[PDB]
């Protein structure tokens, strides 16, 4: 078995290997990358996402989200308070302000220490989940707006044509902005490109151990767990690496820098934080190997998770027994 310790793997494809996206994902899996739940892909030196980032300041963040924490430093939830619209240029200036800027630090490890010590005492503002793309239309390789769609994959594997669409999302971050512990909708893959700015630190639990994280989460968030049998789908719970280690949960960590891709694999729980002002693009995708994960994915039906239009068909076709309850949660 390749990668039996489930380490995060880093890949350096050549420009020739960067042509065929599906082929390369399958290659990474042949080497055991998916066992980690997360892999890093460093693009060939010849590649670029676009020519410059000099002209992005007029993008609008219609609903910036202030991430307010509750709990203790290593075990907390966050809720998202909606703020007034602002442009990317305004948000960048806010991120760089004395109130929100990255503190002085020695290295990524020092900064990580500071994050987990102090995160709860601040409320950073995240420009998350903005439909759009920063890839140039002429970028032919690993362009996240030109990937094969999940609806086409389901049709190719299973024969059923379905409605829905699959487009990327932009994320503008600042110091301490946080992504809570989650797997993707329908336990899909994700791919994330860090276009510019400061790094993003990731934590990940191997897919084969995801239920160990779920069991800890039910212990640590006992009210939430009574409310919903899949409350991690709400994407609000944080657990620090120290707490995970104290509880014997297998996990790994890595820091993504500008110019790098990360892929999350089906049922790979992940969480993390941004180091300072940055912009990422991410989208979900599927492969043939995903279908069995999609059929077994948990679902939130309590009403909290509320998701895209396109998840309807995935539940309807892959999980017809669950469909009626899940759709009630959507309504
Ligand atoms: O970058 C973020 O805030 C969160 N991203 C993801 O969870 C992802 O790409 O799957
Ligand atoms: Mg602009
Ligand atoms: Ni994700
Ligand atoms: Zn729920």
């Amino acid at each position: 078995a390749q990668n039996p310790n489930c380490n995060i793997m880093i890949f350096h494809p050549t420009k020739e290997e960067f042509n065929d996206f599906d082929k390369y994902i399958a290659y990474m899996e042949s080497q055991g990358a998916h066992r980690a739940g997360l892999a890093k892909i460093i693009p060939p030196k010849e590649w670029k996402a676009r020519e410059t980032y000099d002209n992005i300041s007029e993008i609008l963040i219609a609903t910036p989200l202030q991430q307010v924490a509750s709990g203790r430093a290593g075990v907390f939830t966050q809720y998202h308070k909606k703020k007034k619209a602002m442009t990317v240029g305004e948000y960048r200036h806010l991120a760089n302000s004395k109130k929100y800027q990255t503190p002085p630090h020695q290295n990524f490890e020092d900064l990580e220490r500071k994050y987990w010590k102090n995160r709860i005492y601040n409320s950073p503002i995240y420009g998350a989940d903005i439909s759009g793309s920063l890839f140039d239309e002429n970028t032919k390789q690993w362009n996240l707006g030109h990937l094969g769609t999940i609806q086409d994959l389901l049709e190719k594997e299973c024969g059923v044509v379905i409605e829905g669409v699959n487009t990327p999302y932009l994320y503008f971050g600042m110091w301490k902005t946080t992504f809570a512990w989650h797997t993707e909708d329908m336990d899909l893959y994700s791919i994330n490109y860090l276009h510019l700015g400061e790094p993003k630190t990731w934590y990940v639990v191997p897919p084969e151990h995801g239920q160990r994280l779920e069991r800890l989460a039910r212990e640590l968030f006992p009210g939430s767990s009574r409310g919903c049998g899949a409350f991690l789908r709400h994407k609000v719970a944080l657990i620090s690496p120290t707490v995970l280690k104290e509880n014997g949960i297998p996990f790994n960590r890595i820091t993504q820098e500008a110019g790098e891709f990360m892929v999350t694999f089906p049922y790979g729980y992940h969480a993390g934080f941004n180091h300072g002002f940055n912009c990422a693009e991410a989208i979900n995708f599927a492969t043939p190997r995903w279908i069995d994960y999609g059929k077994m994915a948990s679902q939130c039906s309590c009403g909290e998770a509320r998701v895209t239009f396109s998840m309807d068909a995935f539940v309807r076709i892959l999980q017809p027994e669950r469909y009626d309850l899940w759709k009630r949660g959507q309504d």
Side-chain angles (χ1 to χ4, degrees), residues 1-47 49-50 52-81 83-214 216-244 246-305 307-327 329-330:
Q2 296 266 236
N3 192 24
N5 284 357
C6 302
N7 295 316
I8 300 166
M9 300 178 71
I10 304 164
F11 294 89
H12 288 86
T14 62
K15 65 188 193 303
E16 295 78 17
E17 286 173 335
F18 219 51
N19 290 318
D20 184 338
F21 183 84
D22 287 347
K23 180 180 191 176
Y24 200 78
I25 302 303
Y27 169 71
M28 295 159 56
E29 296 181 359
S30 78
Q31 305 301 294
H34 57 295
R35 295 194 65 181
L38 183 66
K40 178 178 292 194
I41 311 92
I42 294 171
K45 71 188 184 293
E46 299 91 354
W47 179 95
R50 65 176 306 106
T52 80
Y53 291 86
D54 292 335
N55 303 115
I56 67 170
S57 304
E58 319 302 308
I59 292 171
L60 191 69
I61 306 172
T63 316
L65 303 172
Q66 180 166 57
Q67 304 187 291
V68 181
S70 296
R72 63 182 175 102
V75 181
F76 64 90
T77 59
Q78 59 184 12
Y79 81 94
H80 293 169
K81 183 173 175 157
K83 307 294 284 181
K84 292 195 151 147
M86 75 186 72
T87 67
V88 164
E90 292 164 339
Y91 176 84
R92 181 176 60 232
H93 190 259
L94 185 69
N96 295 335
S97 70
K98 290 188 191 176
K99 178 169 178 71
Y100 292 109
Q101 69 184 214
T102 317
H105 60 279
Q106 298 290 352
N107 50 43
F108 292 170
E109 182 169 351
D110 189 27
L111 196 66
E112 178 181 43
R113 179 190 68 68
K114 287 173 184 297
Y115 174 85
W116 292 104
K117 184 178 166 55
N118 301 318
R119 159 68 186 96
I120 64 167
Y121 301 111
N122 297 86
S123 300
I125 294 171
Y126 205 175
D129 287 315
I130 297 161
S131 293
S133 185
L134 290 172
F135 285 90
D136 181 323
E137 73 180 2
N138 296 316
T139 301
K140 295 321 186 193
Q141 301 171 314
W142 288 56
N143 182 322
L144 299 188
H146 295 170
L147 301 180
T149 66
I150 299 160
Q151 295 76 19
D152 284 342
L153 181 284
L154 179 157
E155 176 187 332
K156 293 180 293 190
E157 296 298 296
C158 299
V160 57
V161 183
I162 52 167
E163 75 291 350
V165 297
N166 177 205
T167 59
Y169 295 89
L170 302 180
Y171 301 77
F172 292 95
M174 67 168 64
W175 170 234
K176 284 171 174 173
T177 54
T178 301
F179 52 109
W181 281 106
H182 69 286
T183 65
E184 305 301 308
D185 289 345
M186 219 70 185
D187 296 345
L188 281 158
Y189 294 71
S190 64
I191 181 162
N192 181 303
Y193 182 68
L194 190 54
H195 278 284
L196 64 94
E198 303 315 305
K200 187 187 295 284
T201 293
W202 302 66
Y203 305 88
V204 59
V205 174
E208 71 202 63
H209 302 301
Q211 293 84 0
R212 294 184 184 219
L213 183 69
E214 294 173 350
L216 179 61
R218 289 192 302 270
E219 295 163 355
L220 296 178
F221 304 99
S224 293
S225 173
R226 288 185 288 274
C228 180
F231 77 93
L232 294 176
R233 298 283 167 205
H234 303 169
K235 310 194 298 186
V236 303
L238 277 304
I239 305 165
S240 73
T242 293
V243 175
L244 293 181
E246 283 168 349
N247 291 274
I249 308 305
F251 75 96
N252 282 298
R253 76 194 79 190
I254 194 168
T255 299
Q256 177 192 20
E257 300 186 77
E260 304 178 339
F261 289 93
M262 305 298 297
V263 166
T264 83
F265 296 87
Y267 197 59
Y269 274 105
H270 52 286
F273 63 90
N274 294 306
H275 291 208
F277 172 69
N278 66 16
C279 170
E281 181 171 342
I283 196 175
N284 296 119
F285 72 93
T287 70
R289 199 177 66 77
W290 166 66
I291 295 282
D292 282 351
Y293 291 87
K295 291 175 175 168
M296 293 186 306
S298 66
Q299 302 298 359
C300 168
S301 311
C302 75
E304 281 300 307
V307 304
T308 181
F309 181 105
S310 307
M311 225 187 99
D312 192 280
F314 304 157
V315 182
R316 196 172 69 245
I317 298 311
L318 298 181
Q319 309 182 309
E321 189 269 330
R322 288 182 171 175
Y323 182 69
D324 280 354
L325 186 71
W326 172 82
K327 194 161 45 60
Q330 241 45 6

